[PDB]
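Regression test attached.
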Amino acid sequence: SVTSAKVAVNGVQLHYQQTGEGDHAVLLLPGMLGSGETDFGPQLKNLNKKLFTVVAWDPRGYGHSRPPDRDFPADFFERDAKDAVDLMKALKFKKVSLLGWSDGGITALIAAAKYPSYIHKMVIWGANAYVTDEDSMIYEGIRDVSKWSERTRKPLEALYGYDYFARTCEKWVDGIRQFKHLPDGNICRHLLPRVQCPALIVHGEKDPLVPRFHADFIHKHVKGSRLHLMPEGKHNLHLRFADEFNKLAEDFLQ
Ligand SMILES: [Mg+2]
Ligand SMILES: [Mn+2]
């Protein structure tokens, strides 16, 4: 049983879904243009409701956290990280664990580094701490939503309508490509050494969007972290292999 609602955080009404009665609070952070509705159905349904209280949030401009419309300033990952932690604090949780996918994993890393006393444990997958030329070209190949597969475009087009979906995707490409021009193409390389909580980095070996070297790099600089490789996993491993992923996450969180 899942409840959807909005809470006022930093000047915006953020939408979120919540389920479970457990004493261990867990926030699910979605990826690019994501939402709890499109990115975490399996987790909101199957994560142990006796052990955890699960919340899936929609970053400002994404999902149902509209208005406002989405924009990508240089500090957009940091802004999301603040909103994410403030949202859980607004919901009265004293400490939480983070499950971040893609852009949400980048967001989670930043949150753990900036608010260490608030984060218990973290599980992230499909994230990258910096942008290379290879990454930049991958992003550019995502700009045109009309070239997306029908299966991948359908859910987002239905959630946002073609116009907003297409425009926001282009803004995302420009937004994440901007980091390439900064020293080291940096997004959060400098924050990895500041993560103090136990972290599990999962990577789908067949992920076509994020090369494994990005997972190796995060594992290398997040002290005490563990890296788990899934031979058949792709970018959406928590959806395609939900049962396998949920077990990995639940075992690590306990
Ligand atoms: Mg360098
Ligand atoms: Mn929503």
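Expected vs. actual: identical. The pocket of manganese (II) ion (ligand 2) is lined by residues 4, 15, 35-37, 58, 63-64 (CB under 6 Å).
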